[PDB]
């Protein structure tokens, strides 16, 4: 594995571990964004090394808008997550290994 | 030799660590034949089942099932067939639709017992994304997925769980008589 | 000798004709111990069970259970304990309340398997008057009866049922592939 | 990127997205294990391609024991997460890219 790639996975592991611990001292609607930000970082890892085809990018760009929006906005998190799950499901066959 | 039923029934434990060694098709067919002998309401058999085992499909279904730990040999998905349960008023539909699921759970239990008697392991998983698997597997609209169960060979030794004493959950002839 | 599990799992049939010969207490306790090994969601064990066997109480419960045929040796009533499933919004309550019943059905299946391996018979019955048995047995309000199962020695020979072929209810890797 | 590696990152993204949505219909102490299982899968991704040196493995093996333990056990999740964060912090300099 390339040294930069190796670091990126490990630093992703620290974020998930740190977020999990810091969920004991934060509100109840916070594991939603930690997982949403975790999915954002995994897909951001792909296109930084040339692994996003055409729709793996369109989800990371929509994940960006939801994550970087100003706080306090009344967003239906259930509806957008359902749509993103549907989009990402349609993109897996393009990268399927036989 | 084939195990005596009473030792097997007590020993079954949820297995979440599975080994890479795959399960051959004859064993899968025999387990599926053993699991269809469950009771069904009025002999209606209002259920559907699916077997996923291709190495790519098992890992794609695993992602959309966060409650599943470890990568099993194959997946069995149990559903309730709603086509054979609608009648007259919606009250009767609810009455014959809850009972339909109560009988589907028994088939899953039979499957786990059969797959444990053979030296494998399994655990029913209910926390999964229903719509996504329905779209992925091509399941029609009148068939509702209920439980996703992985089956495979345990990777580590089995470890029993901790359960409340018999007195706490069982009463004789009246509520509160945990002695008779 | 104790039966091999695979022959026992296929042979279990619903028994509705029971003989007058009673079942001794040690066997009842052993069957109850075998039936508590079922899986439960998150190890919560949100269930309650009751054993009725006094000759008068079994016949009084039988009347209020029209789906029960024949007079068994004893009755086991399986309920879901709702005290340990309420939390936050009612949506989570429904989510953790359906799953609670899905695990209670497995215990009934285990009980029938254990009582068939011993030479007895049984059949789950869902058509019963819920409120009347709750009042008669003193069951509190937070405990909801689900299934009433009779257990006893079969009076006549066992006769299997007629079931749809494996192809009809089982599909491989896609909806419609009843071959692979 | 190797095709198997590309699939593994994307399937990790689906798990985080699916867990985030399914956190709206599950108890409040569930984002703890989703993040702990997320950190387990990221480190499991490293040693499957030869990227775990000596302590990146000792955390994924301790993460395994915590995750695969029978449910209902009274475990002090704060203490173990603090220890794992401390161990993982000591292992980052070994894989640091200059
Ligand atoms: C699963 C189930 C089976 C029932 C139920 C309810 C449920 C949830 N209720 C029954 C009832 O009220 N009366 C009755 O006679 N049987 C009931 N059953 C069992 C079912 O009818 C039989 O088991 C089935 O029809 C025969 O199959 P078999 O192979 O066991 O003979
Ligand atoms: C009955 C049931 C058990 C489940 C379910 C759902 C139902 C309806 N869902 C589970 C899940 O999503 N993840 C998981 O890990 N287990 C699930 N289980 C089983 C249950 O958690 C275990 O079987 C139990 O906690 C341990 O008991 P054991 O004696 O078998 O080890």
Coordinates of C-alpha atoms and ligand atoms in Angstrom, one line a residue:
Chain A
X1 CA 0.0 0.0 0.0
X2 CA 1.2 3.5 -0.7
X3 CA 2.4 5.3 2.4
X4 CA -0.1 8.2 2.0
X5 CA -3.0 5.7 1.5
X6 CA -1.9 3.7 4.6
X7 CA -2.1 6.9 6.7
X8 CA -5.5 7.8 5.4
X9 CA -7.2 4.6 6.5
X10 CA -5.6 4.7 10.0
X11 CA -6.6 8.3 10.5
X12 CA -10.1 7.3 9.5
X13 CA -10.0 4.7 12.3
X14 CA -9.0 7.3 14.9
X15 CA -11.9 9.5 13.9
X16 CA -14.5 6.7 14.3
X17 CA -12.9 5.7 17.7
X18 CA -12.8 9.3 18.9
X19 CA -16.3 10.0 17.7
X20 CA -17.6 6.9 19.5
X21 CA -16.1 8.0 22.8
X22 CA -17.2 11.6 22.4
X23 CA -20.8 10.4 21.8
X24 CA -21.2 9.9 25.6
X25 CA -20.9 13.6 26.2
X26 CA -22.9 15.0 23.3
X27 CA -26.6 15.1 22.3
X28 CA -28.6 12.1 21.1
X29 CA -28.9 13.2 17.5
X30 CA -25.1 13.2 16.9
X31 CA -24.4 9.6 15.8
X32 CA -26.3 10.6 12.6
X33 CA -23.7 13.1 11.5
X34 CA -20.7 11.0 12.7
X35 CA -21.8 8.2 10.4
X36 CA -22.7 10.6 7.6
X37 CA -19.3 12.3 8.0
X38 CA -17.7 8.9 8.1
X39 CA -19.2 7.9 4.8
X40 CA -18.1 11.3 3.4
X41 CA -14.5 10.6 4.4
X42 CA -14.4 7.1 2.9
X43 CA -15.6 8.3 -0.5
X44 CA -13.3 11.3 -0.3
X45 CA -10.6 8.7 0.1
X46 CA -11.5 7.1 -3.2
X47 CA -11.4 10.0 -5.6
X48 CA -8.2 11.4 -4.1
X49 CA -6.5 8.2 -5.4
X50 CA -8.6 7.9 -8.6
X51 CA -11.2 5.4 -7.5
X52 CA -14.5 7.2 -8.1
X53 CA -16.1 6.5 -11.4
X54 CA -19.1 8.7 -12.1
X55 CA -21.7 8.2 -9.4
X56 CA -19.3 7.5 -6.5
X57 CA -18.5 11.2 -6.9
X58 CA -22.1 12.4 -7.2
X59 CA -22.8 11.0 -3.7
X60 CA -19.7 12.5 -2.1
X61 CA -20.7 15.9 -3.6
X62 CA -24.2 15.6 -2.2
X63 CA -22.8 14.5 1.1
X64 CA -20.7 17.6 1.1
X65 CA -23.7 19.9 0.8
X66 CA -25.6 18.2 3.6
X67 CA -22.5 18.2 5.9
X68 CA -21.4 21.8 5.2
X69 CA -24.8 23.4 5.5
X70 CA -25.2 25.9 8.4
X71 CA -26.4 24.3 11.6
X72 CA -30.0 24.6 12.8
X73 CA -31.6 24.0 9.4
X74 CA -34.7 21.7 9.5
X75 CA -33.6 19.0 7.1
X76 CA -35.5 15.7 6.8
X77 CA -32.4 13.4 7.5
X78 CA -34.5 10.3 6.9
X79 CA -35.4 11.2 3.3
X80 CA -32.0 12.3 2.1
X81 CA -30.3 9.3 3.7
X82 CA -32.8 7.0 1.9
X83 CA -32.0 8.7 -1.4
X84 CA -28.3 8.5 -0.9
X85 CA -28.6 4.8 0.0
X86 CA -30.6 4.2 -3.2
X87 CA -28.0 6.1 -5.3
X88 CA -25.0 4.3 -3.8
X89 CA -26.7 0.9 -4.3
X90 CA -27.0 1.7 -8.0
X91 CA -23.3 2.5 -8.3
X92 CA -21.9 -0.7 -6.7
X93 CA -22.3 -2.9 -9.9
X94 CA -20.0 -0.5 -11.8
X95 CA -17.1 -1.3 -9.5
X96 CA -18.0 -5.0 -8.8
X97 CA -15.0 -7.4 -8.8
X98 CA -15.8 -10.7 -10.6
Chain B
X1 CA -22.7 -39.9 14.9
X2 CA -25.9 -37.7 14.4
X3 CA -26.4 -35.8 17.7
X4 CA -29.2 -36.6 20.2
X5 CA -31.8 -33.8 20.0
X6 CA -31.8 -32.8 23.7
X7 CA -28.1 -32.0 23.9
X8 CA -28.3 -30.1 20.5
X9 CA -31.3 -28.0 21.6
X10 CA -29.6 -26.6 24.8
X11 CA -26.1 -26.0 23.1
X12 CA -27.2 -23.8 20.2
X13 CA -25.6 -20.3 20.6
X14 CA -25.5 -17.3 18.4
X15 CA -22.4 -17.4 16.2
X16 CA -21.0 -14.2 14.9
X17 CA -17.4 -15.2 14.0
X18 CA -17.4 -17.4 10.9
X19 CA -14.5 -19.1 9.2
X20 CA -13.5 -18.7 5.5
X21 CA -14.1 -22.4 4.7
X22 CA -17.2 -22.6 2.4
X23 CA -20.2 -24.9 2.8
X24 CA -21.0 -27.3 -0.1
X25 CA -24.3 -27.3 -1.9
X26 CA -25.6 -30.7 -0.7
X27 CA -25.4 -29.5 2.9
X28 CA -27.2 -26.3 2.1
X29 CA -30.0 -28.2 0.4
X30 CA -30.3 -30.6 3.3
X31 CA -30.5 -27.7 5.8
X32 CA -33.1 -26.0 3.6
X33 CA -35.1 -29.2 3.5
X34 CA -34.9 -29.6 7.3
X35 CA -36.0 -26.0 7.8
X36 CA -39.3 -26.2 5.8
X37 CA -40.9 -28.6 8.3
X38 CA -42.0 -25.8 10.5
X39 CA -45.7 -25.3 11.3
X40 CA -47.7 -22.9 9.3
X41 CA -51.1 -21.4 10.0
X42 CA -53.9 -23.5 8.5
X43 CA -51.3 -25.1 6.3
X44 CA -51.2 -22.0 4.1
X45 CA -47.4 -21.7 3.8
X46 CA -47.6 -17.9 3.3
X47 CA -43.8 -17.4 3.2
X48 CA -40.9 -17.0 0.8
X49 CA -37.2 -17.7 1.3
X50 CA -34.0 -16.8 -0.7
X51 CA -30.5 -18.3 -0.6
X52 CA -27.5 -15.9 -1.4
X53 CA -24.0 -17.4 -1.4
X54 CA -22.1 -15.9 -4.4
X55 CA -19.0 -14.3 -2.8
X56 CA -19.8 -10.8 -4.1
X57 CA -23.6 -10.9 -3.2
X58 CA -23.0 -12.0 0.4
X59 CA -20.6 -9.1 1.0
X60 CA -23.0 -6.6 -0.7
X61 CA -25.9 -7.8 1.4
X62 CA -23.7 -7.6 4.5
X63 CA -23.1 -3.9 4.1
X64 CA -26.8 -3.0 4.1
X65 CA -27.2 -5.2 7.2
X66 CA -25.4 -3.4 10.0
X67 CA -26.5 -6.0 12.6
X68 CA -24.5 -8.7 10.9
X69 CA -21.0 -9.3 12.2
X70 CA -18.4 -11.5 10.4
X71 CA -18.6 -12.8 6.9
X72 CA -20.7 -16.0 6.6
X73 CA -20.6 -18.7 4.0
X74 CA -24.2 -18.0 2.8
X75 CA -27.3 -15.9 3.6
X76 CA -30.9 -17.1 4.0
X77 CA -33.5 -14.4 3.9
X78 CA -37.0 -15.2 5.2
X79 CA -40.1 -13.3 4.1
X80 CA -43.8 -13.3 4.6
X81 CA -45.9 -13.7 1.5
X82 CA -48.8 -11.2 1.8
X83 CA -50.7 -12.4 -1.3
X84 CA -52.2 -15.3 0.6
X85 CA -53.4 -13.3 3.7
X86 CA -55.7 -10.5 2.5
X87 CA -59.4 -11.0 2.9
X88 CA -62.6 -9.0 3.7
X89 CA -62.0 -6.1 6.1
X90 CA -58.5 -4.9 7.1
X91 CA -59.1 -6.2 10.6
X92 CA -59.0 -9.8 9.4
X93 CA -56.0 -8.8 7.3
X94 CA -54.1 -7.7 10.4
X95 CA -55.2 -10.8 12.3
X96 CA -54.0 -13.2 9.6
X97 CA -50.9 -11.1 8.8
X98 CA -49.4 -11.1 12.3
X99 CA -50.0 -14.9 12.6
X100 CA -48.2 -15.3 9.3
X101 CA -45.0 -13.8 10.7
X102 CA -45.3 -15.8 13.9
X103 CA -45.0 -18.9 11.8
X104 CA -42.1 -17.6 9.7
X105 CA -40.0 -17.1 12.9
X106 CA -40.3 -20.9 13.6
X107 CA -38.8 -21.7 10.2
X108 CA -35.7 -19.6 11.0
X109 CA -35.4 -21.3 14.4
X110 CA -35.5 -24.7 12.6
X111 CA -32.9 -23.5 10.2
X112 CA -30.5 -22.4 13.0
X113 CA -31.0 -25.7 14.8
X114 CA -30.3 -27.7 11.7
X115 CA -27.2 -25.6 10.8
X116 CA -25.9 -26.0 14.4
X117 CA -26.4 -29.8 14.4
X118 CA -24.1 -29.9 11.4
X119 CA -21.2 -28.0 13.0
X120 CA -21.9 -24.6 11.6
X121 CA -23.3 -21.4 13.3
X122 CA -25.9 -18.8 12.8
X123 CA -27.7 -15.8 14.3
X124 CA -31.0 -14.1 13.3
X125 CA -30.5 -10.4 12.4
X126 CA -33.5 -8.0 12.3
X127 CA -31.7 -4.7 11.9
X128 CA -31.4 -4.3 8.1
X129 CA -32.5 -1.9 5.4
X130 CA -35.7 -3.5 4.1
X131 CA -36.3 -1.5 0.9
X132 CA -32.7 -1.8 -0.4
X133 CA -32.6 -5.6 -0.2
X134 CA -36.1 -5.8 -1.8
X135 CA -34.8 -3.7 -4.7
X136 CA -31.5 -5.6 -5.0
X137 CA -33.0 -9.1 -4.9
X138 CA -35.9 -8.3 -7.2
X139 CA -38.5 -9.2 -4.5
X140 CA -42.0 -8.2 -5.5
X141 CA -44.1 -5.7 -3.6
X142 CA -46.4 -8.3 -2.0
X143 CA -43.5 -10.1 -0.3
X144 CA -42.1 -8.4 2.8
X145 CA -38.7 -9.3 4.1
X146 CA -38.5 -10.0 7.9
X147 CA -35.3 -11.6 9.0
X148 CA -31.8 -12.0 7.5
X149 CA -29.8 -15.0 9.0
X150 CA -26.2 -15.8 8.2
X151 CA -24.9 -19.4 8.3
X152 CA -21.3 -20.5 8.5
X153 CA -18.7 -22.4 10.4
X154 CA -17.7 -20.9 13.8
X155 CA -14.2 -19.4 13.8
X156 CA -13.6 -19.5 17.6
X157 CA -15.0 -21.7 20.4
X158 CA -18.6 -21.4 21.4
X159 CA -19.4 -19.4 24.5
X160 CA -22.9 -19.5 26.2
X161 CA -24.8 -16.4 27.4
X162 CA -26.0 -15.3 30.8
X163 CA -29.7 -15.9 31.4
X164 CA -32.1 -15.1 34.3
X165 CA -32.9 -18.0 36.6
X166 CA -35.9 -20.2 35.7
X167 CA -37.8 -18.8 38.7
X168 CA -37.8 -15.3 37.2
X169 CA -39.5 -15.9 33.8
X170 CA -41.8 -19.0 34.7
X171 CA -44.9 -19.2 36.9
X172 CA -47.0 -22.2 37.9
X173 CA -50.8 -22.1 38.0
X174 CA -50.8 -18.4 38.9
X175 CA -48.8 -15.2 38.3
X176 CA -46.2 -15.2 41.1
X177 CA -45.9 -18.9 42.0
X178 CA -42.3 -19.6 40.9
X179 CA -42.1 -22.8 43.0
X180 CA -44.7 -25.4 42.0
Chain C
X1 CA -31.4 -43.9 22.7
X2 CA -31.7 -40.1 22.5
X3 CA -32.7 -39.3 18.9
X4 CA -30.3 -37.8 16.3
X5 CA -31.4 -34.2 15.7
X6 CA -31.9 -34.3 11.9
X7 CA -34.5 -37.2 12.0
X8 CA -36.3 -35.4 14.8
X9 CA -36.5 -32.0 13.1
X10 CA -38.2 -33.4 9.9
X11 CA -40.6 -35.8 11.8
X12 CA -42.3 -33.2 14.1
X13 CA -46.0 -33.0 13.3
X14 CA -48.9 -31.1 14.9
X15 CA -50.6 -33.4 17.4
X16 CA -54.2 -32.8 18.2
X17 CA -55.2 -36.2 19.7
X18 CA -53.7 -36.7 23.1
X19 CA -54.0 -39.7 25.4
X20 CA -55.1 -39.6 29.1
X21 CA -51.8 -40.8 30.5
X22 CA -50.3 -37.8 32.4
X23 CA -46.7 -36.4 32.1
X24 CA -44.6 -36.5 35.3
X25 CA -43.0 -33.3 36.7
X26 CA -39.4 -34.1 36.0
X27 CA -40.1 -34.3 32.2
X28 CA -42.0 -31.1 32.3
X29 CA -39.1 -29.3 34.0
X30 CA -36.6 -30.8 31.6
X31 CA -38.7 -29.6 28.6
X32 CA -39.0 -26.2 30.1
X33 CA -35.3 -26.0 30.6
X34 CA -34.7 -27.1 27.0
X35 CA -37.1 -24.4 25.7
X36 CA -35.5 -21.4 27.3
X37 CA -32.3 -21.7 25.2
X38 CA -33.9 -19.8 22.3
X39 CA -32.3 -16.6 21.1
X40 CA -33.6 -13.3 22.4
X41 CA -33.1 -9.8 21.0
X42 CA -30.0 -8.1 22.6
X43 CA -30.1 -10.8 25.4
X44 CA -33.1 -8.9 26.9
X45 CA -35.3 -11.9 27.5
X46 CA -38.5 -9.8 27.4
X47 CA -40.9 -12.8 27.8
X48 CA -43.0 -14.6 30.3
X49 CA -44.3 -18.2 30.4
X50 CA -46.8 -20.1 32.5
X51 CA -47.4 -23.8 33.1
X52 CA -51.0 -25.0 33.7
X53 CA -51.6 -28.7 34.4
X54 CA -54.1 -29.1 37.2
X55 CA -56.9 -31.3 35.8
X56 CA -59.6 -28.6 36.3
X57 CA -57.6 -25.6 35.1
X58 CA -56.5 -27.3 31.8
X59 CA -60.1 -28.0 30.9
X60 CA -61.2 -24.4 31.9
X61 CA -58.5 -22.9 29.7
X62 CA -59.4 -25.3 26.9
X63 CA -63.0 -23.9 26.7
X64 CA -61.8 -20.4 26.1
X65 CA -59.4 -21.6 23.4
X66 CA -61.6 -22.8 20.5
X67 CA -58.6 -23.6 18.4
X68 CA -57.4 -26.4 20.7
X69 CA -58.7 -29.9 19.9
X70 CA -58.3 -32.8 22.4
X71 CA -57.4 -32.6 26.1
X72 CA -53.7 -32.4 26.7
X73 CA -51.6 -33.3 29.7
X74 CA -50.6 -29.7 30.4
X75 CA -50.6 -26.2 28.9
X76 CA -47.7 -23.8 28.4
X77 CA -48.7 -20.1 27.7
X78 CA -46.0 -17.9 26.1
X79 CA -46.3 -14.1 26.6
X80 CA -44.2 -11.0 25.7
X81 CA -43.1 -8.8 28.6
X82 CA -43.7 -5.2 27.5
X83 CA -42.1 -3.6 30.6
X84 CA -38.6 -4.1 29.0
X85 CA -39.4 -2.7 25.6
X86 CA -40.7 0.9 26.0
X87 CA -38.4 3.7 25.2
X88 CA -38.3 7.3 23.8
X89 CA -40.8 7.7 20.9
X90 CA -43.6 5.1 20.1
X91 CA -41.8 4.4 16.8
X92 CA -38.9 2.7 18.7
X93 CA -41.5 1.0 20.9
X94 CA -43.1 -0.6 17.9
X95 CA -39.7 -1.5 16.5
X96 CA -38.6 -3.2 19.7
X97 CA -42.1 -4.7 20.3
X98 CA -42.5 -6.6 17.1
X99 CA -38.9 -8.0 17.5
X100 CA -39.8 -9.1 21.0
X101 CA -42.6 -11.4 19.7
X102 CA -40.4 -12.7 16.9
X103 CA -38.1 -14.1 19.5
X104 CA -41.0 -15.5 21.6
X105 CA -42.1 -17.7 18.7
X106 CA -38.7 -19.4 18.6
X107 CA -39.1 -20.5 22.2
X108 CA -42.4 -22.1 21.4
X109 CA -40.7 -23.9 18.5
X110 CA -38.0 -25.2 20.8
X111 CA -40.6 -26.4 23.3
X112 CA -42.5 -28.4 20.6
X113 CA -39.2 -29.9 19.3
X114 CA -38.2 -30.9 22.9
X115 CA -41.7 -32.4 23.6
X116 CA -41.7 -34.3 20.4
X117 CA -38.2 -35.8 20.9
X118 CA -39.6 -37.2 24.2
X119 CA -42.5 -39.1 22.6
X120 CA -45.2 -36.5 23.2
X121 CA -47.0 -34.1 20.9
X122 CA -48.0 -30.4 20.6
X123 CA -49.4 -27.7 18.4
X124 CA -49.3 -23.9 18.7
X125 CA -52.7 -22.3 19.0
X126 CA -53.3 -18.6 18.3
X127 CA -57.1 -18.4 18.3
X128 CA -58.0 -17.8 21.9
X129 CA -59.7 -15.2 24.0
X130 CA -56.8 -13.0 25.2
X131 CA -58.5 -10.9 27.9
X132 CA -60.3 -13.8 29.6
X133 CA -57.1 -15.9 30.2
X134 CA -55.3 -12.7 31.4
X135 CA -58.0 -12.2 34.0
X136 CA -58.1 -15.9 34.9
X137 CA -54.4 -16.4 35.4
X138 CA -53.8 -13.0 37.1
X139 CA -51.4 -11.9 34.4
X140 CA -50.6 -8.1 34.8
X141 CA -51.4 -5.5 32.2
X142 CA -47.8 -5.1 31.0
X143 CA -47.6 -8.7 29.9
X144 CA -49.4 -9.7 26.7
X145 CA -50.3 -13.4 26.0
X146 CA -49.4 -14.5 22.4
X147 CA -49.6 -18.3 22.0
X148 CA -51.2 -21.1 23.9
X149 CA -49.6 -24.5 23.2
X150 CA -50.9 -27.9 24.5
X151 CA -48.4 -30.7 25.2
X152 CA -49.3 -34.4 25.6
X153 CA -48.8 -38.0 24.4
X154 CA -50.3 -38.6 20.9
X155 CA -53.4 -40.9 21.0
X156 CA -53.1 -42.1 17.4
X157 CA -50.3 -42.6 14.9
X158 CA -48.6 -39.5 13.4
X159 CA -49.6 -38.4 9.9
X160 CA -47.5 -35.9 7.9
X161 CA -49.0 -33.0 6.0
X162 CA -49.0 -32.0 2.4
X163 CA -46.6 -29.2 1.5
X164 CA -45.8 -27.4 -1.7
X165 CA -42.6 -28.5 -3.5
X166 CA -39.3 -26.9 -2.6
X167 CA -39.1 -25.1 -6.0
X168 CA -42.3 -23.2 -5.2
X169 CA -41.2 -21.4 -1.9
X170 CA -37.4 -21.1 -2.5
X171 CA -35.3 -19.0 -5.0
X172 CA -31.6 -18.9 -5.6
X173 CA -29.8 -15.6 -6.1
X174 CA -32.8 -13.9 -7.7
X175 CA -36.6 -14.0 -7.5
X176 CA -37.6 -16.7 -10.0
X177 CA -34.6 -18.9 -10.1
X178 CA -35.9 -22.1 -8.5
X179 CA -33.1 -24.3 -9.9
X180 CA -29.7 -23.2 -8.8
Chain D
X1 CA -6.1 1.2 -6.8
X2 CA -6.6 -2.6 -6.8
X3 CA -10.1 -3.6 -7.7
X4 CA -10.6 -5.5 -4.4
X5 CA -9.3 -2.5 -2.4
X6 CA -11.6 -0.2 -4.3
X7 CA -14.7 -2.3 -3.4
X8 CA -13.7 -2.5 0.2
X9 CA -13.7 1.3 0.8
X10 CA -17.0 1.7 -1.0
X11 CA -18.7 -1.1 1.0
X12 CA -17.4 0.6 4.1
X13 CA -19.2 3.8 3.0
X14 CA -22.5 1.9 2.6
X15 CA -22.2 0.5 6.1
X16 CA -21.7 4.0 7.6
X17 CA -24.6 5.4 5.6
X18 CA -26.9 2.5 6.4
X19 CA -26.0 2.6 10.1
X20 CA -26.6 6.3 10.2
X21 CA -30.1 5.9 8.8
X22 CA -30.9 2.9 11.0
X23 CA -29.9 4.9 14.1
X24 CA -33.3 6.6 13.9
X25 CA -35.1 3.3 14.7
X26 CA -32.7 1.9 17.3
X27 CA -31.8 2.6 21.0
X28 CA -29.7 5.6 22.0
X29 CA -26.6 3.6 23.0
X30 CA -26.1 2.3 19.5
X31 CA -23.9 4.9 17.8
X32 CA -21.2 3.7 20.1
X33 CA -20.9 0.2 18.5
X34 CA -21.4 1.5 15.0
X35 CA -18.4 3.7 15.3
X36 CA -16.5 1.0 17.2
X37 CA -17.4 -1.5 14.4
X38 CA -16.4 1.2 11.9
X39 CA -13.0 1.5 13.4
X40 CA -12.8 -2.3 13.4
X41 CA -13.5 -2.5 9.7
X42 CA -11.0 0.2 8.7
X43 CA -8.1 -1.5 10.6
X44 CA -9.3 -4.9 9.2
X45 CA -8.9 -3.3 5.8
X46 CA -5.2 -2.5 6.5
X47 CA -3.9 -5.9 7.5
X48 CA -5.8 -7.7 4.8
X49 CA -3.5 -5.9 2.3
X50 CA -0.4 -5.8 4.5
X51 CA -0.6 -2.4 6.1
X52 CA -0.6 -3.2 9.8
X53 CA 2.8 -3.0 11.4
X54 CA 2.8 -4.3 15.0
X55 CA 0.4 -2.2 17.1
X56 CA -2.2 -1.5 14.3
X57 CA -2.9 -5.2 14.7
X58 CA -3.0 -5.2 18.6
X59 CA -5.9 -2.7 18.4
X60 CA -7.9 -4.6 15.8
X61 CA -7.5 -7.8 17.9
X62 CA -8.7 -6.0 21.0
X63 CA -11.5 -4.4 19.0
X64 CA -12.5 -7.9 18.0
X65 CA -12.9 -9.1 21.6
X66 CA -15.1 -6.1 22.6
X67 CA -17.3 -6.4 19.5
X68 CA -17.7 -10.2 19.5
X69 CA -18.5 -10.5 23.2
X70 CA -22.0 -11.7 24.1
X71 CA -24.5 -8.9 24.5
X72 CA -25.7 -7.8 27.9
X73 CA -22.3 -7.8 29.6
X74 CA -21.7 -4.7 31.7
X75 CA -18.6 -3.2 30.1
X76 CA -17.2 0.2 30.9
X77 CA -17.2 1.5 27.3
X78 CA -15.6 4.8 28.4
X79 CA -12.5 3.1 29.9
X80 CA -11.7 0.7 27.0
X81 CA -12.3 3.4 24.4
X82 CA -9.9 5.7 26.2
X83 CA -7.2 2.9 26.3
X84 CA -7.7 2.1 22.6
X85 CA -7.4 5.8 21.7
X86 CA -4.2 6.0 23.8
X87 CA -2.7 2.9 22.1
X88 CA -3.6 4.0 18.6
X89 CA -2.1 7.4 19.2
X90 CA 1.2 5.7 20.1
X91 CA 1.1 3.7 16.8
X92 CA 0.7 6.6 14.4
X93 CA 4.4 7.8 14.4
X94 CA 5.4 4.3 13.1
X95 CA 3.4 4.9 9.9
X96 CA 3.9 8.6 9.5
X97 CA 4.7 9.8 6.0
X98 CA 7.4 12.6 5.9
Ligands
LIG1 C1 -47.4 -20.9 13.3 C2 -48.8 -21.1 13.9 C3 -49.4 -22.3 13.7 C4 -50.7 -22.5 14.2 C5 -51.4 -21.5 14.8 C6 -50.8 -20.2 14.9 C7 -49.5 -20.0 14.5 C8 -48.9 -18.7 14.6 N1 -52.7 -21.6 15.3 C9 -53.3 -22.9 15.2 C10 -54.6 -23.0 15.7 O1 -55.2 -22.1 16.2 N2 -55.2 -24.3 15.6 C11 -54.5 -25.3 15.0 O2 -55.1 -26.4 14.9 N3 -53.3 -25.2 14.5 C12 -52.6 -23.9 14.6 N4 -51.4 -23.8 14.1 C13 -50.6 -24.9 13.5 C14 -51.1 -25.3 12.1 O3 -52.5 -25.2 11.9 C15 -50.6 -26.7 11.7 O4 -49.4 -27.0 12.4 C16 -50.4 -27.0 10.3 O5 -51.6 -26.5 9.6 C17 -50.2 -28.4 10.0 O6 -48.8 -28.7 9.7 P1 -48.1 -30.0 10.3 O7 -47.0 -30.4 9.3 O8 -47.5 -29.6 11.6 O9 -49.1 -31.1 10.4
LIG2 C1 -35.0 -13.3 18.1 C2 -34.1 -12.3 17.5 C3 -32.7 -12.4 17.8 C4 -31.8 -11.5 17.2 C5 -32.3 -10.5 16.4 C6 -33.7 -10.4 16.1 C7 -34.6 -11.3 16.7 C8 -36.0 -11.2 16.3 N1 -31.5 -9.5 15.8 C9 -30.1 -9.6 16.1 C10 -29.3 -8.7 15.5 O1 -29.7 -7.8 14.7 N2 -27.9 -8.7 15.7 C11 -27.4 -9.7 16.6 O2 -26.2 -9.8 16.8 N3 -28.3 -10.6 17.1 C12 -29.6 -10.6 16.9 N4 -30.5 -11.5 17.5 C13 -29.9 -12.6 18.4 C14 -29.6 -12.1 19.8 O3 -28.9 -10.9 19.7 C15 -28.6 -13.2 20.4 O4 -29.0 -14.4 19.9 C16 -28.6 -13.1 21.9 O5 -28.4 -11.8 22.4 C17 -27.5 -14.0 22.5 O6 -28.1 -15.2 23.0 P1 -27.3 -16.6 22.7 O7 -27.5 -17.6 23.8 O8 -27.8 -17.2 21.4 O9 -25.8 -16.3 22.6

